[PDB]
Design an enzyme around this catalytic site. Sequence first.
Site: not given
Lengths: 11, 165
Positions: B55, B60, B63, B102, B113, B122, B126
């Site tokens: 992904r 951004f 991942q 997660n 990521f 985030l 994370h």
Amino acid sequence: XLLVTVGLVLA
Amino acid sequence: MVNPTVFFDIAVDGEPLGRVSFELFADKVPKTAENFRALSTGEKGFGYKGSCFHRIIPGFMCQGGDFTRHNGTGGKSIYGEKFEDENFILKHTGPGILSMANAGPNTNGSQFFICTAKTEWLDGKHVVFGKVKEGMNIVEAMERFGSRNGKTSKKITIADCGQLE
């Protein structure tokens, strides 16, 4: 949207 | 002691792109850094080698880390399936931050990521545990294959990986 998940990926 | 450096050689549909190396902040998040280090050498008999970035969303993050199911639903840590959020000392301050994916509080496995922008929403959710040391230009090249919804147009894999230091 912009999340980073494992399982239910959301918007 | 010195923080470990690990590398990934990235390939795009089997063609080598280049090497990204990472510094892991074992001094601040020793358990999370160790998980990623041992999955990069494959020393527990499983790890990241041959898995893909499933992904990628341009602007951004990229991942990856699902080496069991390979589709984004799997992966496991070296401590068993999941482990706790070690701490949230470090934040998602800009390009190059390495952080854990997660499914809510205390569900870390192997998926991670690499941020290509500051992602402060985030923070506190994370665990940040490393940063790109060299090869940020290879991460930027990877972004060109992603899309707003995350599917990649080419298969982006970790052709090889291990520890340098």
